[PDB]
């Protein structure tokens, strides 16, 4: 019912700029297509709280996605790019930490909050993106 830490990621953000995110991309092992189309993208990425739950929805021109979840308690989840993956979202100190598993493979999306942008690092093996989002 009250105020969480959770709130400060809640709100309406649009994505501002765009780093290594193709390279971030090759490297998870997207195909061409998809990543032109992908990497072409300013989603608006929507994110709220309702008791345990939050909930992320990206819409873009790409593709529309919905996940909600508990933190700590891993669920399924298909991303934009079409993998089928198992996913875990904590908040370690301040950063929702999202974890998603196929095949063998792991990537790491990092979402936190500096200044008055939301910054996302995706991480692959060796390879990272960051992706900077502003409030619409
Ligand atoms: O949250 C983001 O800004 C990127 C989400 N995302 C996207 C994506 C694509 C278009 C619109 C928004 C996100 C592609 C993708 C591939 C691998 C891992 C994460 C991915």
Redesign the pocket.
């Given at each position: 019912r009250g105020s969480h830490m959770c709130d400060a990621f809640v709100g309406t953000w649009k994505?501002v700029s765009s780093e290594n995110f193709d390279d971030?991309?090759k490297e998870?092992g997207?195909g061409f297509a998809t990543r032109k189309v992908?990497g072409m993208?300013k989603?608006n990425?929507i994110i709220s709280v309702n008791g345990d739950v939050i909930t992320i929805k990206?819409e873009?021109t790409?593709?529309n996605t919905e996940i909600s979840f508990i933190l700590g308690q891993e669920f399924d989840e298909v991303?934009?790019?079409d993998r089928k993956v198992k996913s875990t979202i904590t908040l370690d100190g301040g950063v929702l930490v999202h974890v998603q598993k196929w095949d063998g493979k792991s990537?790491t999306?990092k979402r936190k909050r500096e200044d008055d942008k939301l910054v996302?690092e995706?991480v692959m093996k060796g390879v990272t993106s960051t992706?900077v989002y502003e409030r619409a």
């Open positions: 994505l971030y991309m998870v997207v992908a993208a989603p990425m990206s873009s790409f593709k991303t934009a790019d990537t999306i996302v995706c992706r």
